[PDB]
Design a protein around this nucleic acid. Structure first.
Ligand SMILES: [Mg+2]
Ligand SMILES: [Mg+2]
Ligand SMILES: [Mg+2]
Ligand SMILES: [Mg+2]
Ligand SMILES: [Mg+2]
Ligand SMILES: [Mg+2]
Ligand SMILES: [Mg+2]
Ligand SMILES: [Mg+2]
Ligand SMILES: [Mg+2]
Ligand SMILES: [Mg+2]
Ligand SMILES: [Mg+2]
Ligand SMILES: [Mg+2]
Ligand SMILES: [Mg+2]
Ligand SMILES: [Mg+2]
Lengths: 58, 117, 141, 106, 55, 143, 78, 145
RNA sequence: ACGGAGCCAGCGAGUACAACCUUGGCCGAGAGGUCUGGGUAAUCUUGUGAAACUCCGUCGUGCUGGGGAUAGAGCAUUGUAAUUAUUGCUCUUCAACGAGGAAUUCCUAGUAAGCGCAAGUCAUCAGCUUGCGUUGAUUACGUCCCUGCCCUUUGUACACACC
């Protein structure tokens, strides 16, 4: 949207923190280890590094 | 000199509409009324008038007692007897003609006077 | 084109950019005659390089200095540095090495920061006090 | 027929630097191997974003304070360029972290 | 709990108009750049936010 | 033999141009003058009981001559220093806008200023020449 | 605290013709002249100290050496 | 520059508005000595009176004194604005008076006992002789008499 | 001190699912309101034309034009709601105060001190606080005497350790 660049960057950072705390909360039993957020013009992919990959996959 | 408000003598004061008071009554209350008032003081004044008319014309009308403190003393409510809440008890107060302009909370001393020794 | 060089001088924030050309003794800072710097007491300071060397040294030269930033004394010192640096740069570039040599000797021989920039610069204020190296006060009781 | 010069304008953004710098390097290398006219990768004052907080959560202790920050770099660029090659350049060579925006200068 | 009396009071503004979004606290809140989070929650999550101690 | 306003010392130039406006009957003076503080900062009027308006106009015209274009708010910030806020630490408070607006309107009425396209006021040709003449005369009076 | 100064007017608020005679023949024999000195001789209150001193610059009785404000420094015609 | 001062004409002690003033002070600040008269007010009154700013309180003539006092007691006729006054409106009669010294104490007092009679918090506090403007008093004042 | 006049900064921040920074043109003495603007940001506020300071005047040793608390009245502004005075502005009132006992704090160069400005809080509110810059020094460039600290040696009935 029409949002200042600094505000948008802070929003992206707090969204990163969003996901990080989310995954720590839920995926812990499945061995969550880290998160990354990569963005293309098309889609915003979230790459989830975990110990037990299949259980996260389900 | 009995009393006059701004050259509006007490006799003239006795029954003036609030809108007439608006042109008098310096900037604070002026801004208040200009910026609407609320629903509640309508009910307060209605209750006051009801107690005024119902009383048998010889005694000070029955205690109209309420928690609404921000209300302000307008001409067509002189003579009523209001219990203005205090945080403990509705402090009783009659409405002298000089009460006008000020607040109802003014006569509800929110704290007992402090004394040492 | 007219032989002309541009220099700068600084004082903690204040920047004086001087452009010197082959002119007729034209000396304007902010488009005003140099005689009218407001400090009025730091006034001699804006003259200060010239009197060291003698204004005859620049009779075929014109100097215009645009200056920004700083306070007032900082502004004046930046103007001084700009003037001196412009003289040195022009004389070195177009006149002769020895000419620049006596100019540098005369400038450095008096108030060394007249030619060289001052590095003396404020440092951040730490917390716990009104100044970078001050503390509020203590009670003890 | 899309021969009209577009005056396309790019603006980058990055919390960090090296990704932004190599992205700009890639954009300029693509433009130059495509024979485009460019106004160079201008450098803008990296806006520092500072927050000073009290370390202690309770206020007890000697007054001690800290200053977190980022330093954002924008560094817009601009081309006098046609569409398809340039729009394809815009949609390629993006790494994470660096955010890119495009305005057509229509 | 009258539908027009329960939670009647406005909250367009003031201290309680906004929450920590991490703990829902009111005290020690930061509103700069829209963080809307409190002192110390910021104190540890800032590194993942992108903040780092420099000076 | 050429000269400009930037070529003349300031303070004496402002007072000279103020006196020239004083002797001339132009520059109509609003009625509410001689009572206003010219700034919320001020608590005593101008010490000059009459004619301070002319000096203010001189300063304003000189200032517009110096800059590209200026509005009333720029003057308001420029004029006026610090309150003695009783016990409060001083801050800056902007001067009175009525004085600056009336000064600008009067200058427009005289014709030394015109409303710039960019938004604000700027100096016209004839007024600029007027200030040039005043500058040359002040320099001559100096020597 | 207590007004123990015991100070009278210690100056002159409105001049005398005799006071004008004093100041007129007084410019000689005082080689240093300043508003401070003129008040110091009990003869000028100080509000009119500058007034009188400027008046002395009517026939060039006392030439200026530095005419800055906050003071006034002059020396007799010699 | 200076004048011969016209000995035999400079007033020393004046009695204006049944209050005594000293003639050696500048006229504006001299008039400030009267209660209910400030420096700004006295200055505007003086300049409305055409009497010079740089005069002394002993050098003005008697007709000038009469002009000054009639100005100072009836401002509204003399294009002194409806504001600027000591007691604008006067919450009794709605006409903008400007109280002078003795009238000033009389009226301020009568307002104080009106507030006492009104029995407002302002009134009760004024009766108590504490801080009435709602300031902190836990550590302030602590000592008057 | 008060009038005028001169007219220099640097850190910031700023409206979105809403309503910020506000230029300019209006009007009003003022706070202010008003209509159009620009600005999601080296673009506009902004060159934040800030203060101290600079120059010319007035005042003149007077608790005085120092000092501005405490006090009446008015005009507005944020707010559902300002009374127990939010804040601003206008007038008037002008108090206490004479360089501050024993004590005690901080400080060695862009330093202390003066001077403000931006940001946090914020709807409205700072005397706070972080940072920023400006005007910018006196005096050391040393010693364990007071208050402590390092380590070594020594003595101890101490080990909750000279409280
Ligand atoms: Mg300091
Ligand atoms: Mg000024
Ligand atoms: Mg002061
Ligand atoms: Mg004073
Ligand atoms: Mg001044
Ligand atoms: Mg700058
Ligand atoms: Mg300023
Ligand atoms: Mg006094
Ligand atoms: Mg000070
Ligand atoms: Mg606090
Ligand atoms: Mg040492
Ligand atoms: Mg100690
Ligand atoms: Mg033991
Ligand atoms: Mg013992």
């Amino acid at each position: 949207a029409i949002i200042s660049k600094k505000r948008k960057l802070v929003a992206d950072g707090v969204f990163y923190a969003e996901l990080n705390e989310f995954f720590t909360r839920e995926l812990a039993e499945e061995g969550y280890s880290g998160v990354e957020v990569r963005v293309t013009p098309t889609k915003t992919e979230i790459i989830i590094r975990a110990t037990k990959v299949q259980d996260v996959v389900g | 000199k009995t009393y006059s408000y701004k050259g509006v003598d007490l006799e003239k004061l006795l029954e003036m509409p609030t809108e007439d008071f608006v042109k008098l009554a310096p900037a604070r209350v002026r801004r208040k009324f200009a910026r609407g008032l609320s629903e509640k003081p309508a009910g307060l004044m209605k209750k006051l008038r009801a107690a005024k008319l119902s009383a048998p014309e010889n005694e000070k009308p029955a205690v109209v007692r309420t928690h609404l403190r921000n209300m302000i003393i307008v001409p067509e409510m002189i003579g009523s007897v209001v219990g203005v809440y205090n945080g403990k008890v509705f402090n009783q107060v009659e409405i002298r003609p000089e009460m006008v302009g000020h607040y109802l909370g003014e006569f509800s001393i929110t704290y007992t006077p402090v004394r040492h020794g | 084109t007219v032989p002309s060089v541009q220099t700068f001088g600084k004082k903690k924030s204040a920047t004086a950019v001087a452009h010197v050309k082959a002119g007729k003794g034209l000396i304007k800072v902010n488009g005003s005659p140099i005689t009218l710097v407001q400090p009025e007491i730091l006034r001699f300071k804006v003259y200060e390089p010239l009197l060291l060397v003698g204004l005859d040294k620049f009779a075929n030269i014109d100097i215009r200095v645009k200056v920004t930033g700083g306070g007032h004394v900082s502004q004046v010192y930046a103007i001084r540095q700009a003037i001196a640096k412009g003289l040195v740069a022009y004389h070195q570039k177009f006149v002769d090495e020895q000419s620049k040599n006596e100019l540098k000797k005369a400038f450095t021989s008096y108030d060394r920061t007249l030619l060289i920039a001052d590095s003396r610069r404020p440092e951040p204020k730490k917390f716990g006090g009104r100044g970078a190296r001050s503390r509020f006060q203590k009670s003890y009781r | 027929q899309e021969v009209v010069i577009h005056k396309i304008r790019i603006n980058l953004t990055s919390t960090k630097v090296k990704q932004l710098e190599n992205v700009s390097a890639n954009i300029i290398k693509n433009a130059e191997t495509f024979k485009l006219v460019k106004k160079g990768p201008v450098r803008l004052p990296t806006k520092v974003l500072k927050i000073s907080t009290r370390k202690t959560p309770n206020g007890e202790g000697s007054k001690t304070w800290d200053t977190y920050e980022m330093r954002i770099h924008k560094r817009y660029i601009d081309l006098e360029a046609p569409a398809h090659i340039v729009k394809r350049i815009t949609q390629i060579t993006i790494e994470p972290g660096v955010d890119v925006e495009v305005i057509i200068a229509a | 709990a009258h539908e027009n009396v329960w939670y009647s009071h406005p909250r367009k503004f003031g201290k309680g108009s906004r929450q920590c979004r991490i703990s829902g606290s009111h005290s020690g809140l930061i509103r700069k750049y829209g963080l809307n989070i409190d002192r110390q929650s910021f104190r540890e999550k800032a590194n993942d936010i992108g903040f780092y101690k420099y000076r | 033999p050429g000269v400009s306003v930037r070529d003349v010392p300031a303070q004496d130039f402002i007072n000279n141009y103020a006196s020239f406006l004083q002797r001339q009957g132009k520059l109509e003076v609003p009625g509410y003058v001689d009572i206003v503080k010219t700034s919320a900062g001020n608590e005593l009027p101008p010490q000059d009981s009459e004619g301070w308006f002319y000096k203010r106009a001189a300063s304003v015209a000189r200032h517009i001559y110096l800059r590209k274009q200026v509005g009333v708010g720029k003057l308001n910030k420029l004029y006026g220093g610090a309150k003695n806020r009783g016990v409060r630490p001083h801050k800056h408070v902007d001067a009175s806008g009525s004085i600056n607006r009336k000064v600008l309107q009067s200058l427009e009425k005289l014709g030394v200023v015109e409303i710039s396209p960019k938004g604000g006021r700027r100096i016209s040709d004839n007024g600029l020449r007027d200030l040039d003449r005043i500058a040359a005369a002040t320099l001559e009076d100096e020597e | 605290s207590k007004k123990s100064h015991k100070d009278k007017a210690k100056h002159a608020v409105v001049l005398d013709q005799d006071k004008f005679d004093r100041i007129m023949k007084e410019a000689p024999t005082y080689r240093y002249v300043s508003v401070s000195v003129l008040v110091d001789r009990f003869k000028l209150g100080g509000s009119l100290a500058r007034v009188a001193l400027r008046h002395l610059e009517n026939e060039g009785i006392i030439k200026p050496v530095s005419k800055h404000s906050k003071q006034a420094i002059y020396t007799r015609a010699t | 520059s200076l004048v011969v001062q016209e000995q035999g004409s400079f007033q020393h002690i004046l009695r204006l508005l049944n209050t005594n003033v000293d003639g050696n002070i500048n006229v504006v600040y001299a008039l400030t000595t009267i209660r209910g008269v400030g420096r700004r007010y006295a200055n505007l009154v003086c300049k409305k009176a055409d009497v010079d700013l740089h005069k002394r309180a002993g050098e003005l003539t008697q007709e000038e004194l009469e002009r000054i006092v009639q100005i100072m007691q009836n401002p509204t006729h003399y294009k002194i604005p409806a504001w600027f006054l000591n007691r604008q409106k006067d919450v009794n009669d709605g006409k903008d008076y400007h109280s002078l010294a003795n009238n000033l104490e009389s009226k301020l007092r009568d307002d104080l006992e009106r507030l006492k009679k009104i029995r407002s918090h302002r009134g009760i506090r004024h009766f108590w002789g504490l801080r009435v403007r709602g300031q902190h008093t836990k550590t302030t004042g602590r000592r008057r008499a």
